[PDB]
Amino acid sequence: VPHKSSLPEGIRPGTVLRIRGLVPPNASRFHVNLLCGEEQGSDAALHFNPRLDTSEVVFNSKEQGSWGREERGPGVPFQRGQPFEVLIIASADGFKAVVGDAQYHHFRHRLPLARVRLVEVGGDVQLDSVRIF
Amino acid sequence: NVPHKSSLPEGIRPGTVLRIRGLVPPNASRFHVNLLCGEEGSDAALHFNPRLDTSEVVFNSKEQGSWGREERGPGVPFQRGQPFEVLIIASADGFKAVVGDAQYHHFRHRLPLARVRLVEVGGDVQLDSVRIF
Ligand SMILES: OC[C@H]1O[C@@H](O[C@H]2[C@H](O)[C@@H](O)[C@@H](O)O[C@@H]2CO)[C@H](O)[C@@H](O)[C@H]1O
Ligand SMILES: OC[C@H]1O[C@@H](O[C@H]2[C@H](O)[C@@H](O)[C@@H](O)O[C@@H]2CO)[C@H](O)[C@@H](O)[C@H]1O
């Protein structure tokens, strides 16, 4: 079951998204999206896309249906059949992705942080908990 | 119990996250997390003090040797013999203290974030991990 929840107040520097779950044994990909709205194809301030199928974790943003320049994290700190914990931490400069015990990648803001109003977690992932602090 | 004491010579900013994982000993009385202005009784931007003996969690600041106005959180989200996870999250306006799965208390800043240059975790606590993200 995907997570999709509204952040009508937005998120500010000091917001922490904590995701706990398990990558299923047959997983291809899953995604964490910080979106500007609920509509179809909404702009994305952050698309965080662990890809088991292609052994990469892609970061990107989306504006007017156009993806930006992809960033990739170092290695893939996810494994099929294994549980994980991700922090997505918002600062004034960007989003810090923490996986397990280590900062994994820093994605500088493209879209103003104030554009974020929705969080979505979906794809091939079993979710134990999603929290916004 | 081995305490933690580490330097933040660059300071901390909105989006800094202190994650503490540990266990409250079965005979614990109290433990503390301090964000301090320096290496010495240095000023404390945050003193986070779970007290199992008196069933309270106290928050305070200290300047020039004098404690400020105490704040207390609702209940005690710690138990002797039980493991715990605390997030101390810095925003522009204060520190969000998260325990377990929920925000426990918000402590508005008394000292500027730029003056924080040391993290201490000590007292009656067994530390499994202390991370600054
Ligand atoms: O950039 C995020 C999107 O990537 C799309 O796939 C890219 C792929 O990463 C890139 O290597 C290149 O081959 O073009 C593809 C299509 O843009 C995904 O399809 C999309 O879901 C986002 O993950
Ligand atoms: O930062 C709070 C400090 O409190 C001290 O204890 C207080 C106590 O909380 C209060 O209710 C009253 O009884 O006065 C005491 C003395 O200030 C602690 O002793 C100190 O270690 C700090 O935690």
Return the number of CB contacts < 8 Å for A and B. Answer: 48
Contact yes or no for A30/A126 (Cβ under 8 A): no
Nearest Cα neighbor of B37 from B71, B3, B12, B69 is: B12
Write b or e for each residue in B32-47: b if 16 or more Cβ atoms lie within 10 A of its Cβ, otherwise e. bbbbbbeeeebbbbbb
**Bridge partners, B58 (sequence order):** B49, B72
Q: How far is the CA of A2 from the centre of ligand 1 (A)?
A: 20
How far is it, in rounded angstroms, from Cα A82 to Cα A5? Answer: 25
Question: The domain at A3-132 falls in which architecture?
Answer: Sandwich (2.60)
Q: Which amino acid is at B25?
A: P
How far is it, in rounded angstroms, from Cα A30 to Cα A66? Answer: 20
- Main-chain phi, psi angles of A114, to 5 degrees: -65, -10
The number of helices, as runs of H, and strands, as runs of E, in chain B is: 0, 12
The alpha carbon of residue A131 is apart from the nearest alpha carbon of chain B, in Å, by 8
Which tokens go with B68?
A: 């400020």
How far is it, in rounded angstroms, from Cα B92 to Cα B114? Answer: 11
How far is it, in rounded angstroms, from Cα B104 to Cα B85? Answer: 12
Nearest Cα neighbor of B91 from A10, A60, A130 is: A10
Contact yes or no for B59/B88 (Cβ under 8 A): no
How far is it, in rounded angstroms, from Cα A86 to Cα A77? Answer: 10
Any CB–CB contact under 8 A between A98 and chain B? yes
How far is it, in rounded angstroms, from Cα B25 to Cα B79? Answer: 9
The alpha carbon of residue A81 is apart from the nearest alpha carbon of chain B, in Å, by 24
Q: What is the DSSP string of A16-67?
A: EEEEEEE--TT--BEEEEEES-SSTT--EEEEEEEETTTTEEEEEEEETTEE
Nearest Cα neighbor of A11 from A124, A128, A119 is: A119
Handedness of CA A53, A54, A57, A59 (dihedral sign): negative
Q: How far is CA B19 from CA A48, A68, A70, A107, in A?
A: 22, 32, 29, 20
Which residue reads 């138990």 in tokens?
Answer: B79
Ligand lying nearest the CA atom of residue A66:
1
The number of helices, as runs of H, and strands, as runs of E, in chain A is: 0, 12
**Angle, alpha carbons B46-B24-B70 (nearest 5°):** 30
Which residue reads 């300071």 in tokens?
Answer: B11
Contact yes or no for A88/A3 (Cβ under 8 A): no
Domain boundaries, chain B: 4-132
Q: How far is the CA of A68 from the centre of ligand 1 (A)?
A: 10
Sheet holding A15-22, edge to edge: A102-108, A94-99, A83-90, A15-22, A126-132
* The listed CATH number (3.40.50.720, 2.60.120.200, 3.30.70.260, 3.30.420.40) that belongs to domain B4-132: 2.60.120.200
